[PDB]
Amino acid sequence: FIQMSVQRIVEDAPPIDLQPPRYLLKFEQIYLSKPTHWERDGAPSPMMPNEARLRNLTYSAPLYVDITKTVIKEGEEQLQTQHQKTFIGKIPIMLRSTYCLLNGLTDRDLCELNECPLDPGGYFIINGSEKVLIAQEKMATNTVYVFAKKDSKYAYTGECRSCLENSSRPTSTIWVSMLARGGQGAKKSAIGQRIVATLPYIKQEVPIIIVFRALGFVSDRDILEHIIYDFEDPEMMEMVKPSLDEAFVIQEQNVALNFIGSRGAKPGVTKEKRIKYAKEVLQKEMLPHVGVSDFCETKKAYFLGYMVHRLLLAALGRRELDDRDHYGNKR
Amino acid sequence: GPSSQNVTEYVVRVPKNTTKKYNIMAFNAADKVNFATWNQARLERDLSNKPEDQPWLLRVNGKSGRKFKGIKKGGVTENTSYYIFTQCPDGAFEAFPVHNWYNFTPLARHRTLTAEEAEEEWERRNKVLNHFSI
Amino acid sequence: DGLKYSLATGNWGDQKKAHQARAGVSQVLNRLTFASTLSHLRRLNSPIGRDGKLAKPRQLHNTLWGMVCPAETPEGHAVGLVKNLALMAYISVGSQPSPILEFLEEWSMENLEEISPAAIADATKIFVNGCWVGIHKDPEQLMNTLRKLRRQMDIIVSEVSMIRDIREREIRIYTDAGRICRPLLIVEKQKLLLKKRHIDQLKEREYNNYSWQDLVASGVVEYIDTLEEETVMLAMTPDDLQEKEVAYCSTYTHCEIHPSMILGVCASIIPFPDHNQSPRNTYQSAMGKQAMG
Amino acid sequence: AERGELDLTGAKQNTGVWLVKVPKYLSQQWAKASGRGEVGKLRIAKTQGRTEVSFTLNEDLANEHPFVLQSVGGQTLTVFTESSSDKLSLEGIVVQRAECRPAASENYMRLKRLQIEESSKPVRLSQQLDKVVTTNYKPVANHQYNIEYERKKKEDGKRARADKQHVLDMLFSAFEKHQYYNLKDLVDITKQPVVYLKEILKEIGVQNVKGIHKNTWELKPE
Amino acid sequence: VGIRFCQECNNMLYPKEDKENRILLYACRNCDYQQEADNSCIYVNKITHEVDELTQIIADVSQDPTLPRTEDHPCQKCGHKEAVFFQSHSARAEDAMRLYYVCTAPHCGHRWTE
Numbered sequence A: 001f002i003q004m005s006v007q008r009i010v011e012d013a014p015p016i017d018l019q020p021p022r023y024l025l026k027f028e029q030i031y032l033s034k035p036t037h038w039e040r041d042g043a044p045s046p047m048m049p050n051e052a053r054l055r056n057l058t059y060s061a062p063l064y065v066d067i068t069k070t071v072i073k074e075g076e077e078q079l080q081t082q083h084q085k086t087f088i089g090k091i092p093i094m095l096r097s098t099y100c101l102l103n104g105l106t107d108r109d110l111c112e113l114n115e116c117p118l119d120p121g122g123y124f125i126i127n128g129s130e131k132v133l134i135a136q137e138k139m140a141t142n143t144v145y146v147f148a149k150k151d152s153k154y155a156y157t158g159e160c161r162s163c164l165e166n167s168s169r170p171t172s173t174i175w176v177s178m179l180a181r182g183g184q185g186a187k188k189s190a191i192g193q194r195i196v197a198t199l200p201y202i203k204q205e206v207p208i209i210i211v212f213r214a215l216g217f218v219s220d221r222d223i224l225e226h227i228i229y230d231f232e233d234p235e236m237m238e239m240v241k242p243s244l245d246e247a248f249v250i251q252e253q254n255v256a257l258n259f260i261g262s263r264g265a266k267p268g269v270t271k272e273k274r275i276k277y278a279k280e281v282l283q284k285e286m287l288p289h290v291g292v293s294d295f296c297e298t299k300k301a302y303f304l305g306y307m308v309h310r311l312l313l314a315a316l317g318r319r320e321l322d323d324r325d326h327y328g329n330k331r
Numbered sequence B: 001g002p003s004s005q006n007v008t009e010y011v012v013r014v015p016k017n018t019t020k021k022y023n024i025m026a027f028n029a030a031d032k033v034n035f036a037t038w039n040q041a042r043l044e045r046d047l048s049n050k051p052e053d054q055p056w057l058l059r060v061n062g063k064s065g066r067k068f069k070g071i072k073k074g075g076v077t078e079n080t081s082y083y084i085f086t087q088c089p090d091g092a093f094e095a096f097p098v099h100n101w102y103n104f105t106p107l108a109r110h111r112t113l114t115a116e117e118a119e120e121e122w123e124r125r126n127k128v129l130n131h132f133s134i
Numbered sequence C: 001d002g003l004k005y006s007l008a009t010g011n012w013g014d015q016k017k018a019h020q021a022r023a024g025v026s027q028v029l030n031r032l033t034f035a036s037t038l039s040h041l042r043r044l045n046s047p048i049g050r051d052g053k054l055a056k057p058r059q060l061h062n063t064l065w066g067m068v069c070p071a072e073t074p075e076g077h078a079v080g081l082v083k084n085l086a087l088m089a090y091i092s093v094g095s096q097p098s099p100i101l102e103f104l105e106e107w108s109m110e111n112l113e114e115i116s117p118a119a120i121a122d123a124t125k126i127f128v129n130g131c132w133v134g135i136h137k138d139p140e141q142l143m144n145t146l147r148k149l150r151r152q153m154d155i156i157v158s159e160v161s162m163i164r165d166i167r168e169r170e171i172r173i174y175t176d177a178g179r180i181c182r183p184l185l186i187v188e189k190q191k192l193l194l195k196k197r198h199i200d201q202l203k204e205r206e207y208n209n210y211s212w213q214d215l216v217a218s219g220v221v222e223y224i225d226t227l228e229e230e231t232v233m234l235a236m237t238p239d240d241l242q243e244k245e246v247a248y249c250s251t252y253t254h255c256e257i258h259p260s261m262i263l264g265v266c267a268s269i270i271p272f273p274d275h276n277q278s279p280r281n282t283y284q285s286a287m288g289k290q291a292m293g
Numbered sequence D: 001a002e003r004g005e006l007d008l009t010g011a012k013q014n015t016g017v018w019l020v021k022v023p024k025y026l027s028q029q030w031a032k033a034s035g036r037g038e039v040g041k042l043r044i045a046k047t048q049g050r051t052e053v054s055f056t057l058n059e060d061l062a063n064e065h066p067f068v069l070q071s072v073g074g075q076t077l078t079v080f081t082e083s084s085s086d087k088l089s090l091e092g093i094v095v096q097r098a099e100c101r102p103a104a105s106e107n108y109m110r111l112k113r114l115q116i117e118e119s120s121k122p123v124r125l126s127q128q129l130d131k132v133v134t135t136n137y138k139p140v141a142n143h144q145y146n147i148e149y150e151r152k153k154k155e156d157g158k159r160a161r162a163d164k165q166h167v168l169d170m171l172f173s174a175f176e177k178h179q180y181y182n183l184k185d186l187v188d189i190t191k192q193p194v195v196y197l198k199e200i201l202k203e204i205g206v207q208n209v210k211g212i213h214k215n216t217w218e219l220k221p222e
Numbered sequence E: 001v002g003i004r005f006c007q008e009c010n011n012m013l014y015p016k017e018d019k020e021n022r023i024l025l026y027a028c029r030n031c032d033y034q035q036e037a038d039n040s041c042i043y044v045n046k047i048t049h050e051v052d053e054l055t056q057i058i059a060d061v062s063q064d065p066t067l068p069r070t071e072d073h074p075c076q077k078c079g080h081k082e083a084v085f086f087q088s089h090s091a092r093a094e095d096a097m098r099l100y101y102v103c104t105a106p107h108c109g110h111r112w113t114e
């Protein structure tokens, strides 16, 4: 978190633009200096941990970033004044870590500072009290999992936790359920067992072929090979066909974006606006790891087809449904 | 055979400068386009986007004789540059850099925009199927 | 005062918006006895709300073979929803999967973009960190090479896990963090890569500086995570199975270092645990979180 | 002769071109092309059962690369161009695609070292500082405050209160340009203080909001 | 059971017919390319769905480190006496403890059921 993630969080963040003249701020390399506590007079000084516990004092190492400020004022002259090592705040430090003060001191030394060599470390003395952070288990991400809901009309449903790699916290959960032999058959038009996909930032569920077309790949053949790779199986054609004819003429990519845009937010303002947000939402919110770049959504298409294909595998019984307790499906 | 014993040796040159930035055109082979049928062509950047980024619009054999849309590939020199190798009268080879990759897809004849009303008509047909019951 | 606030109050999130913030974390370390201190430090917390009517997660799943200590479970509203790690597990710290991708470039990987959609069906699809990164026609070779690589500490760290499943032909190489990993010994045919000379180098560690790093970098130990554990065949002891008779099997790939390292830091203070009833041993780990000293 | 007019000559000539994929490090070597741009010599050997195309770097460019032939089927590739004179031309159709690979030699040993040299700029790192850098200085007048002072002095706030009839004639010229005029625009026009300007504006006409705010000023009908 | 894609407009074709010759046809609704239906047969639903796994088993299962290696049944096709024997590992699990075995001899893959 100190050695690498912190530099990555400051280094990679939106540039500060504020403008007539405009002002630009760029962050550089974070420096973190050993824990130091400055007394009433203020001589900054070292804080061997024993003192911190006794004087009810938090253990924190000063964090200093470097920011360079360049201003363009329509004079076309650039003055990137550099401020270096500017206080941003203080980060808590685990004891016995590469960045603590007890790191690698031979036993005679720890004993001189009134610390115990046998003691494990790995705790934060916050407010003069040691705090241990319990590792908290999480559901695994990046994997198409198929879990079957007993009560709902969805015979099977597949989900992908969406994570983008040391970049952004929001994670999405595209679901690609099938409406086959579930709950009450009701109507749902003549078509039945239709693959349907909830998506991030939408209103009503979207038929799958449409999403694929909207990403593009309008040709119904293209959509089919992107999902079912081999056309030899007889059972496969029957399974992928009811949904294949959800409807059509949604073939213009823009038309499709509009249908999903109308299938989104609230009573649509205008097609042009509806197309704009829906167009950008699919590029970033959906499948961020597969296609972080807005361009070349080709990678996104292969993964979207994969989730549909894995749901089909569960239906035909080729691959057994997944488990929610396996410790590999947990991070 | 001549080609079965075709041993040769030439000289390659990538001129640092070119008076014709070379790119890549990309039609489909499943289409098997007869280039001989192309008496003429027009080639302009696509107007939907209302320059170097603009998709191409190719009009062959008149405005509606033949028309294709070319869409730029994501990358072309992201890891490896692409070169055009051409044979010269001196036998030596000349290499030309590929600036860009454009994908030319055969355009649907009908074109136009179906609009919300066409989508609503599909929804109305779905509603009629929903209406049927006992 | 964001990190201090969260690291003292234990609320994870902004102080103002307490709408989406969980708690029950960053609790004070228990210092009553040294054994309790170690157990408190090495603990996971499955995060399900406690009272979902069903008890699916609490039941020990079979995939906790050395991932978690089976005996150590708290008694109360937190039953089987607070587990402690076994002595030898080692959670992955996290790496960048870019180097491994460049290796497969010189090892016959076809980037998906170049590949025709048609050929995908016959061969196997490498997936990395969950993003499809291509297709390779002859799978075993990539694998056999890939393991050799992790084993000699070049491109891929020991932490990367190369899982390959024959039926679906997806070799997923996961190099992210938070994956429970168990060091396990590696055996070729029916022979131990670990050999006598190595133990001799380890015995005089003080002068020859032959560290555990050296044992791994010699390729006689590998960290087999749960995903890798799905494809492998392990032997409880070398004498028990790496010997020939009407073998239950002859393909054992990996054999375990000592089976009594599947128990944590507070069920290793108990002698003869198997002889005693299992609930009695759980009750005693709870009593140990009580004994002074 | 038109900008959107595409030359079809190459195509209609059935002109053929070759397409070759080249690694960047080689391509970086090629940006340093020897002489005019000559980068070396190609070597094509064809036999009854095999065909070998290879490239060797120029002695100068240096200070065996086997080719892998690739299929061009599935996509009819051609080469269009944009001249320095912006004229457009189709040179040919691609009759061959190929990839330059090592001679079954470079694995991840020489590669990793070229890659180690290739890394050049590692993604930055959090360095360890010694002691603590100075944070608070002793400035007397803040620099930003000193800059406004010279401007505040230069034009002493606003002005005085005189020559209202002379100001009225200037306001009337502005009123001709727009019947309703923003008060803030009038404030920019007159150096005199806003309160004095408002009194003259009230005399000429009642302020009208106009439903757009800004209390636009218009000439009285009387 | 199959599909027809419009040769040109590229769209799934549909079973249509003309009273004029009372003839089965397959037509896309996207445009008008249409062809008489050659199969003369349309939607099929099978409830029994009794499917032999011999078809499904991939031949690569032979190398699984874990699967067993009996020497009891030699390959009929090639005679290597070693094989890997696995159960269905699929649904339709009302009556299935059959033991599909597979030729392990490298490069054979005879999928002999029993």
Ligand SMILES: [Zn+2]
Residues within 6 Å of the ligand: E006, E008, E009, E010, E011, E028, E029, E030, E031, E032, E033
């Ligand atoms: Zn048609």
Ligand SMILES: [Zn+2]
Residues within 6 Å of the ligand: E075, E076, E077, E078, E079, E103, E105, E108, E109, E110
């Ligand atoms: Zn055989």
